[PDB]
């Protein structure tokens, strides 16, 4: 039911693309996401569960045939759980006990709101006690001069883990356990390695509250984008909205689609569930249903570890 | 580990720095801080300890002025410029064995009075020779640096 | 699984090492070693693979394609690689020792901490599920040591007291009574607490100043002074080489890996700062 | 049901036990198991009155009190100033989840009448207090969990937890 | 944003020739729908007042003197309230079908792997992909990029080989080749867009902007600028001793300030001491003349005042920075001893 | 074949030498000698290279380009150098001896330890594998001394008892009485046990106090006294010079290295503390 992904060494999940030497008189550089996107985690299990007799040009019609349904990802150090929390470009790894009073916090008076929010991302933010940015710098050597090439230098801020950390997901499938278990995986990045571990864990499947946490990017179907962005306060209480690419598919070596999403760790109001349903058309509902299977539209209650969905 | 030894080196020095009224005794101490620290780690601790006490010329009011320096701040070291300096460095070494609990303070203070017990002090330090030499290093090296800095020629 | 096998190995510094990292850390070192998440020296997987791949292409120039299939094909062709190195993890650093007769006398000893031995265990557990050449003879030893966590430990020697690096007095306890040592060198291995070990280890790291001299007046230039950090001789880094299932890796693991004894990692080879030795924990166990 | 009483850990003098009842059975919810305390529960919307050390109730979801769940009966002495609950597991909002619960229990919490005399004001306060933190080593938990203070997991493992886990809003009234 | 895309379209067709504009024309037309969206995405707020809050019958009321303070208070709060949600301007774009199906207009190379993110942004896909330095001419002119060869040295002048560009970033590069086009926004509703463009094509202003390689060469330029005659004979042909052949200018009040010591501060240092085919040469040139070889490092200095917006609220945090923090104003009584000592003093 | 040529050489001190402090660890001596990782004296190859380089750039002005090739350019390097120096391991130090009784009395002897011979064997084994060379003559010798480890031995002479450096009494076994000396010397070589060897060696080091006299009072200046550490005369170090195929490595190994006998290493040259003699293993066999 529950899958722990144990990184054996610093990882890198880069966004923003174009990490390779193209321009002559210039270095390259890449950062890393603190939490891997669900496309990354889906592609990892899809890599284990791969049979050539499938797909032929799909990468999600092909992917959704392998895994049943994945739920969003968070952190687990020592049996504690930490969850992404996002603000106006600030990201924090906050503990479960601090999300309870967010809806009352986001509604307080001006000065009492800022103080409460400020202390969440600075004092009660447990990210930097758990994760450090190891800014590795690499180099390409030409065997002719046996020195560095013309500006073939790159900086890659890896994801160093000060403590023991796992990424936590849940799968609807149970025939999946004895397949992806104890497996050494090439957890997406610069050829890095993590270990997989499956154990049972009972959590809710569907709930109703007035404020959810986005435990995974909530994809916006690019057709409601106008009727959604013009009135954003009706849907997102706090967090970050931006255009993201869904990744890079292996079987075709192509960058996946690029569509606006609500980044994981945002606080979405209940108004976001019905809005999506009443804006997504069945032309794409069959598509966005798959996007949910790999783990994108995953919501969490600020109460407790209860995992909802949007189209499900 | 030895982060509080740079502190200890500052209270021990400020004591020795004040119980050295004569200017030529400070200069003579600056000579001991440089030299004595470099024989403890080439010749050994107790070979240098024997050399220190032999030049310190104990068994006087000096040997009791030391006992006062452990607590009082008005004590003074009187004697030959070469004696006060060598005896002031004996304080430095003993002040550390007290504050760090390597040697019991009550033993050391009564071994510095009872003539019959001083041999038992030297006998105790012989077995604590490896342990002591390791710990005093940061402390003595700091005393060496403070001497070269604070003890100046007029 | 596409990680059919895993070949852990020990990286044994024949000379001092310097795998550089720019100017990433503070202490006073201008050219420091490559660190890890908690401050110990490591060899990054990029530097360890690139050095072994730059080597071994001059050594076996006929097998350049076998190496390209496994180690990357640095050319514009971008078929996926078949072999992965994990970051080399500091396993044991040499330390000067003065023991109070305490023994058959030693002058130097191997020193580990419990933080370092957890990451080694982490690497060891992670590949036990695919290594059907199960090296539990080694994984168990770390397990018993980690059970005794919370005090300074000597594995096979019987010292009970020593002075490490002329500055730190520690009292040691046998594992339970005895156990075979990992490194077959006739040298004890101490496992210290993480606070005391981090000071003893930082004292074995070589931090030198270096000088550029005005050749006409034989004096140092202006700003011709800088500082570097080396990892001593006899240091031991532990890493793993993971291989996907293929026919090239069968050649690579049989024909190529048997003949790697000495390679050169890091930089400053002119100073002779890269000669290192791999030991392939499948015969030392 | 099991007569599981939930005791506060504020900055107060009267915090010693105020319950001369103990395990009684052999069961408990919070455990110190080679990681630190387990299954700590949070009482939100409640405060603590400095005098008359008890959980003062409020309606602010921000005010909160955190304690442990021990199976001792509520002192068998007051029977008035105590809130008595018939509650399942899924409604016990707990921290450090290790083991689930029998999912129907009976809990007593140190209560207080609202005391509508004067206007409320609840203050955030910590309980680090290194001079006091040593009291809590053997004030509350060891008297329930003596097994850990003697020949098992260290009681310094509990120290960096209570200066980390428990931090309650007070009244200063 | 529209009136700047308008002028950029007009101006680029005015200079339909000359290279790098037959390219800008080809993308300002291929990506009309994308360039509709402003890339900056401001946010507006508003409060209001009434006669009730300020008057009794026709004169000011008591406590009215605090209306403006309280009204500006709500305005500030409404901003900080909305700053909780960060919506990047790229999210407004519509790129789903342009990337799932290869409908993205890619002038230049064809992405072997999808769509090739921009090299400036990193977020948007690129429209103008650029070939590497295998060779440019035989790879520029065959592809649609270059119509001929003469335009190549004019395209390279504005786009580096290998550099991918998105529609927004090329607009940054196009305006970077002609900054007077900003007059469209500067004046506004004063001149018609065409009249603005006309004065730009009715002149030849050349505004050269420094680069990080120019800033890393000040002390070198300023050294060979006072050892001119000596450093001059040996080269005589390397554009270091070239004579200023134009009257170009810059907002950089150091380039303008010299520009006139036969030194030609226009030379790209990456074809010089910062190059690879010419590094050792100018090391030797600088060697003989006691000129120190330059360092590749500059300094990016960024100043910002502390608690200024917090000062506009009349608060005292800029005074007692750290002793009292912005969070303390949720309850000023906790710092009553200090906030009064200052206020009583002021 | 990774290295074109491989040249091990001994470094016999003609005068007391002093390579400067370098390190960052605070120490009692003001200007200490360069230390090993075991604490023995050594010469960082960065100091071997810089000194030998500047010596060759003087004694061979016409071949100034062959040296820039093998030992790297100075002011503007296009390319990495081809030659490498390994850090000079301490091989043998002289120690004055009071020989209790034997047919031939001795006034001083060479003292070496088993830990030092193991580092030399590490150099010889790795350089043997990373090159065409095979120093079986040395290796067969040192691998016989390392078999008697843990026991004080005299190499050829017959001593059986002695008082080294006036403070240490040792009893010595005889190894074979047939194996030839490592170096060309009638002076015997004692291979001490590493524990007693560390203390015997620290006695051979030369600690020296120096002053700066005020010219107008003929007294020490204000704080013008400092200490200083020298390695004795007749001390033998051991390093290796390595090189890759470049057509200048062949010239280096032919002229430059075959006309190098005396170099000035280290500092304090104005007081004669640097003159040293190089003996190539191709010759001392
Ligand atoms: Zn862009």
Short mmCIF file of N, CA, C and O in Angstrom, two decimals, chain F residues 92-170:
data_model
loop_
_atom_site.label_atom_id
_atom_site.label_comp_id
_atom_site.label_asym_id
_atom_site.label_seq_id
_atom_site.Cartn_x
_atom_site.Cartn_y
_atom_site.Cartn_z
N UNK F 92 65.45 6.41 5.60
CA UNK F 92 66.36 6.08 6.69
C UNK F 92 66.90 7.38 7.26
O UNK F 92 67.20 8.31 6.52
N UNK F 93 67.03 7.42 8.58
CA UNK F 93 67.58 8.60 9.25
C UNK F 93 68.81 8.14 10.02
O UNK F 93 68.87 6.99 10.47
N UNK F 94 69.84 8.97 10.14
CA UNK F 94 71.00 8.58 10.94
C UNK F 94 70.73 8.77 12.42
O UNK F 94 70.04 9.71 12.83
N UNK F 95 71.27 7.87 13.22
CA UNK F 95 71.14 7.96 14.67
C UNK F 95 72.45 7.54 15.30
O UNK F 95 72.98 6.48 14.96
N UNK F 96 72.97 8.36 16.20
CA UNK F 96 74.21 8.00 16.85
C UNK F 96 73.99 6.80 17.76
O UNK F 96 72.94 6.67 18.40
N UNK F 97 74.97 5.92 17.80
CA UNK F 97 74.84 4.61 18.42
C UNK F 97 75.99 4.39 19.39
O UNK F 97 77.14 4.73 19.10
N UNK F 98 75.67 3.86 20.56
CA UNK F 98 76.69 3.35 21.46
C UNK F 98 76.62 1.84 21.43
O UNK F 98 75.87 1.22 22.19
N UNK F 99 77.39 1.23 20.53
CA UNK F 99 77.35 -0.21 20.36
C UNK F 99 77.97 -0.88 21.57
O UNK F 99 79.12 -0.60 21.93
N UNK F 100 77.20 -1.75 22.22
CA UNK F 100 77.65 -2.38 23.46
C UNK F 100 78.95 -3.14 23.23
O UNK F 100 79.96 -2.91 23.91
N UNK F 101 78.96 -4.05 22.26
CA UNK F 101 80.16 -4.80 21.94
C UNK F 101 79.97 -5.51 20.61
O UNK F 101 78.90 -6.06 20.33
N UNK F 102 81.03 -5.49 19.79
CA UNK F 102 81.13 -6.25 18.55
C UNK F 102 82.54 -6.03 18.02
O UNK F 102 83.31 -5.23 18.55
N UNK F 103 82.88 -6.77 16.96
CA UNK F 103 84.22 -6.68 16.40
C UNK F 103 84.49 -5.28 15.86
O UNK F 103 85.53 -4.68 16.14
N UNK F 104 83.55 -4.74 15.08
CA UNK F 104 83.68 -3.40 14.54
C UNK F 104 82.79 -2.45 15.32
O UNK F 104 81.57 -2.64 15.34
N UNK F 105 83.35 -1.45 16.00
CA UNK F 105 82.50 -0.49 16.70
C UNK F 105 81.97 0.56 15.74
O UNK F 105 82.57 0.86 14.71
N UNK F 106 80.82 1.11 16.09
CA UNK F 106 80.12 2.05 15.23
C UNK F 106 79.77 3.30 16.01
O UNK F 106 79.48 3.25 17.21
N UNK F 107 79.80 4.43 15.32
CA UNK F 107 79.49 5.71 15.93
C UNK F 107 78.11 6.21 15.53
O UNK F 107 77.52 7.02 16.26
N UNK F 108 77.56 5.73 14.42
CA UNK F 108 76.22 6.09 14.00
C UNK F 108 75.73 5.04 13.03
O UNK F 108 76.51 4.25 12.49
N UNK F 109 74.42 5.03 12.81
CA UNK F 109 73.76 3.99 12.05
C UNK F 109 72.55 4.60 11.36
O UNK F 109 72.07 5.66 11.75
N UNK F 110 72.08 3.95 10.30
CA UNK F 110 70.81 4.30 9.69
C UNK F 110 69.68 3.58 10.41
O UNK F 110 69.74 2.37 10.61
N UNK F 111 68.64 4.32 10.77
CA UNK F 111 67.47 3.77 11.44
C UNK F 111 66.27 3.92 10.52
O UNK F 111 65.98 5.02 10.04
N UNK F 112 65.58 2.81 10.27
CA UNK F 112 64.32 2.82 9.56
C UNK F 112 63.31 1.98 10.33
O UNK F 112 63.67 1.20 11.21
N UNK F 113 62.04 2.15 9.99
CA UNK F 113 60.96 1.45 10.66
C UNK F 113 60.19 0.62 9.64
O UNK F 113 60.32 0.79 8.43
N UNK F 114 59.37 -0.30 10.16
CA UNK F 114 58.59 -1.15 9.27
C UNK F 114 57.46 -0.38 8.62
O UNK F 114 57.08 -0.69 7.49
N UNK F 115 56.90 0.62 9.30
CA UNK F 115 55.86 1.43 8.69
C UNK F 115 56.38 2.18 7.48
O UNK F 115 55.64 2.37 6.51
N UNK F 116 57.63 2.62 7.52
CA UNK F 116 58.20 3.35 6.39
C UNK F 116 58.47 2.42 5.22
O UNK F 116 58.22 2.79 4.07
N UNK F 117 58.98 1.23 5.48
CA UNK F 117 59.22 0.28 4.40
C UNK F 117 57.92 -0.18 3.76
O UNK F 117 57.95 -0.61 2.60
N UNK F 118 56.81 -0.10 4.47
CA UNK F 118 55.53 -0.47 3.86
C UNK F 118 55.06 0.60 2.90
O UNK F 118 54.45 0.29 1.87
N UNK F 119 55.32 1.87 3.21
CA UNK F 119 54.96 2.93 2.28
C UNK F 119 55.81 2.87 1.03
O UNK F 119 55.34 3.18 -0.07
N UNK F 120 57.08 2.49 1.17
CA UNK F 120 57.94 2.35 0.00
C UNK F 120 57.46 1.20 -0.87
O UNK F 120 57.39 1.32 -2.10
N UNK F 121 57.12 0.07 -0.25
CA UNK F 121 56.57 -1.04 -1.01
C UNK F 121 55.27 -0.66 -1.69
O UNK F 121 54.99 -1.13 -2.79
N UNK F 122 54.47 0.21 -1.07
CA UNK F 122 53.26 0.69 -1.72
C UNK F 122 53.59 1.52 -2.95
O UNK F 122 52.92 1.40 -3.98
N UNK F 123 54.61 2.37 -2.86
CA UNK F 123 55.05 3.11 -4.03
C UNK F 123 55.58 2.17 -5.10
O UNK F 123 55.24 2.30 -6.28
N UNK F 124 56.40 1.20 -4.71
CA UNK F 124 57.02 0.32 -5.69
C UNK F 124 56.00 -0.57 -6.38
O UNK F 124 56.12 -0.85 -7.57
N UNK F 125 54.99 -1.04 -5.64
CA UNK F 125 54.01 -1.93 -6.24
C UNK F 125 53.12 -1.19 -7.23
O UNK F 125 52.86 -1.68 -8.33
N UNK F 126 52.64 -0.01 -6.85
CA UNK F 126 51.75 0.74 -7.72
C UNK F 126 52.48 1.26 -8.95
O UNK F 126 51.96 1.17 -10.07
N UNK F 127 53.68 1.81 -8.77
CA UNK F 127 54.47 2.28 -9.90
C UNK F 127 54.85 1.12 -10.80
O UNK F 127 54.97 1.29 -12.02
N UNK F 128 55.03 -0.07 -10.24
CA UNK F 128 55.30 -1.24 -11.05
C UNK F 128 54.12 -1.56 -11.96
O UNK F 128 54.31 -1.95 -13.12
N UNK F 129 52.90 -1.40 -11.45
CA UNK F 129 51.73 -1.74 -12.23
C UNK F 129 51.35 -0.64 -13.21
O UNK F 129 50.82 -0.93 -14.29
N UNK F 130 51.60 0.62 -12.86
CA UNK F 130 51.26 1.75 -13.70
C UNK F 130 52.36 2.09 -14.69
O UNK F 130 52.40 3.22 -15.19
N UNK F 131 53.24 1.15 -15.00
CA UNK F 131 54.36 1.41 -15.88
C UNK F 131 54.92 0.08 -16.37
O UNK F 131 54.52 -0.99 -15.92
N UNK F 132 55.85 0.17 -17.31
CA UNK F 132 56.56 -1.01 -17.78
C UNK F 132 57.62 -1.47 -16.80
O UNK F 132 58.02 -2.63 -16.84
N UNK F 133 58.06 -0.58 -15.91
CA UNK F 133 59.15 -0.89 -15.00
C UNK F 133 58.76 -2.03 -14.06
O UNK F 133 57.59 -2.34 -13.86
N UNK F 134 59.79 -2.65 -13.49
CA UNK F 134 59.59 -3.69 -12.48
C UNK F 134 60.82 -3.68 -11.59
O UNK F 134 61.86 -4.24 -11.95
N UNK F 135 60.70 -3.02 -10.44
CA UNK F 135 61.81 -2.90 -9.49
C UNK F 135 61.85 -4.13 -8.59
O UNK F 135 61.75 -4.05 -7.36
N UNK F 136 61.97 -5.29 -9.23
CA UNK F 136 61.99 -6.54 -8.48
C UNK F 136 63.19 -6.62 -7.55
O UNK F 136 63.12 -7.28 -6.51
N UNK F 137 64.28 -5.95 -7.89
CA UNK F 137 65.47 -6.00 -7.05
C UNK F 137 65.21 -5.38 -5.69
O UNK F 137 65.46 -6.00 -4.65
N UNK F 138 64.70 -4.14 -5.66
CA UNK F 138 64.27 -3.54 -4.40
C UNK F 138 63.15 -4.34 -3.77
O UNK F 138 63.19 -4.66 -2.58
N UNK F 139 62.12 -4.65 -4.56
CA UNK F 139 60.94 -5.29 -3.99
C UNK F 139 61.28 -6.62 -3.34
O UNK F 139 60.76 -6.94 -2.27
N UNK F 140 62.17 -7.40 -3.96
CA UNK F 140 62.58 -8.65 -3.32
C UNK F 140 63.33 -8.39 -2.03
O UNK F 140 63.24 -9.19 -1.09
N UNK F 141 64.08 -7.29 -1.96
CA UNK F 141 64.78 -6.95 -0.73
C UNK F 141 63.81 -6.54 0.36
O UNK F 141 63.80 -7.10 1.46
N UNK F 142 62.96 -5.55 0.07
CA UNK F 142 62.07 -5.01 1.08
C UNK F 142 61.03 -6.03 1.50
O UNK F 142 60.59 -6.04 2.65
N UNK F 143 60.62 -6.92 0.59
CA UNK F 143 59.66 -7.94 0.98
C UNK F 143 60.27 -9.01 1.87
O UNK F 143 59.52 -9.80 2.45
N UNK F 144 61.59 -9.06 1.99
CA UNK F 144 62.23 -9.93 2.97
C UNK F 144 62.37 -9.26 4.32
O UNK F 144 62.27 -9.93 5.35
N UNK F 145 62.60 -7.95 4.34
CA UNK F 145 62.64 -7.23 5.61
C UNK F 145 61.25 -7.17 6.22
O UNK F 145 61.08 -7.32 7.43
N UNK F 146 60.23 -6.94 5.39
CA UNK F 146 58.86 -6.87 5.89
C UNK F 146 58.34 -8.22 6.35
O UNK F 146 57.27 -8.27 6.96
N UNK F 147 59.05 -9.31 6.07
CA UNK F 147 58.64 -10.60 6.60
C UNK F 147 59.00 -10.75 8.07
O UNK F 147 58.30 -11.43 8.82
N UNK F 148 60.08 -10.10 8.50
CA UNK F 148 60.52 -10.13 9.88
C UNK F 148 59.86 -9.06 10.74
O UNK F 148 60.43 -8.66 11.76
N UNK F 149 58.69 -8.59 10.33
CA UNK F 149 58.09 -7.42 10.97
C UNK F 149 57.79 -7.68 12.44
O UNK F 149 57.55 -8.82 12.86
N UNK F 150 57.81 -6.61 13.22
CA UNK F 150 57.56 -6.71 14.64
C UNK F 150 58.75 -7.18 15.44
O UNK F 150 58.57 -7.82 16.48
N UNK F 151 59.96 -6.87 14.98
CA UNK F 151 61.17 -7.34 15.64
C UNK F 151 62.34 -6.52 15.14
O UNK F 151 62.58 -6.47 13.94
N UNK F 152 63.05 -5.86 16.06
CA UNK F 152 64.20 -5.05 15.68
C UNK F 152 65.24 -5.92 15.00
O UNK F 152 65.63 -6.96 15.53
N UNK F 153 65.69 -5.51 13.83
CA UNK F 153 66.69 -6.26 13.08
C UNK F 153 67.76 -5.31 12.57
O UNK F 153 67.48 -4.15 12.23
N UNK F 154 69.00 -5.79 12.55
CA UNK F 154 70.08 -5.12 11.83
C UNK F 154 70.27 -5.83 10.50
O UNK F 154 70.20 -7.06 10.43
N UNK F 155 70.48 -5.06 9.45
CA UNK F 155 70.39 -5.62 8.11
C UNK F 155 71.53 -6.60 7.84
O UNK F 155 71.30 -7.79 7.59
N UNK F 156 72.76 -6.12 7.88
CA UNK F 156 73.89 -7.00 7.63
C UNK F 156 74.82 -7.14 8.82
O UNK F 156 75.29 -8.24 9.09
N UNK F 157 75.09 -6.06 9.54
CA UNK F 157 76.12 -6.07 10.56
C UNK F 157 75.70 -6.98 11.72
O UNK F 157 74.60 -7.54 11.75
N UNK F 158 76.61 -7.14 12.67
CA UNK F 158 76.39 -8.00 13.84
C UNK F 158 76.49 -7.13 15.09
O UNK F 158 77.59 -6.83 15.56
N UNK F 159 75.34 -6.73 15.62
CA UNK F 159 75.30 -5.83 16.77
C UNK F 159 74.70 -6.49 18.00
O UNK F 159 75.35 -6.51 19.05
N UNK F 160 73.46 -6.97 17.92
CA UNK F 160 72.79 -7.73 18.97
C UNK F 160 72.41 -6.88 20.18
O UNK F 160 71.66 -7.34 21.05
N UNK F 161 72.89 -5.64 20.24
CA UNK F 161 72.63 -4.75 21.37
C UNK F 161 73.20 -3.39 21.04
O UNK F 161 74.28 -3.29 20.46
N UNK F 162 72.49 -2.34 21.45
CA UNK F 162 72.96 -0.99 21.20
C UNK F 162 72.10 0.00 21.97
O UNK F 162 71.01 -0.34 22.44
N UNK F 163 72.60 1.22 22.08
CA UNK F 163 71.89 2.31 22.72
C UNK F 163 71.78 3.41 21.68
O UNK F 163 72.76 4.12 21.40
N UNK F 164 70.61 3.56 21.08
CA UNK F 164 70.41 4.50 20.00
C UNK F 164 70.05 5.87 20.54
O UNK F 164 69.21 5.99 21.43
N UNK F 165 70.69 6.89 19.99
CA UNK F 165 70.40 8.28 20.33
C UNK F 165 70.41 8.49 21.83
O UNK F 165 69.62 9.25 22.38
N UNK F 166 71.33 7.80 22.50
CA UNK F 166 71.69 7.97 23.90
C UNK F 166 70.59 7.60 24.88
O UNK F 166 70.82 7.69 26.09
N UNK F 167 69.41 7.20 24.42
CA UNK F 167 68.29 7.01 25.33
C UNK F 167 67.53 5.71 25.15
O UNK F 167 66.74 5.36 26.04
N UNK F 168 67.72 4.98 24.06
CA UNK F 168 66.90 3.81 23.77
C UNK F 168 67.80 2.60 23.59
O UNK F 168 68.69 2.61 22.75
N UNK F 169 67.55 1.57 24.39
CA UNK F 169 68.29 0.32 24.29
C UNK F 169 67.49 -0.66 23.45
O UNK F 169 66.29 -0.85 23.67
N UNK F 170 68.15 -1.29 22.48
CA UNK F 170 67.50 -2.24 21.59
C UNK F 170 68.40 -3.45 21.39
O UNK F 170 69.63 -3.35 21.43
#
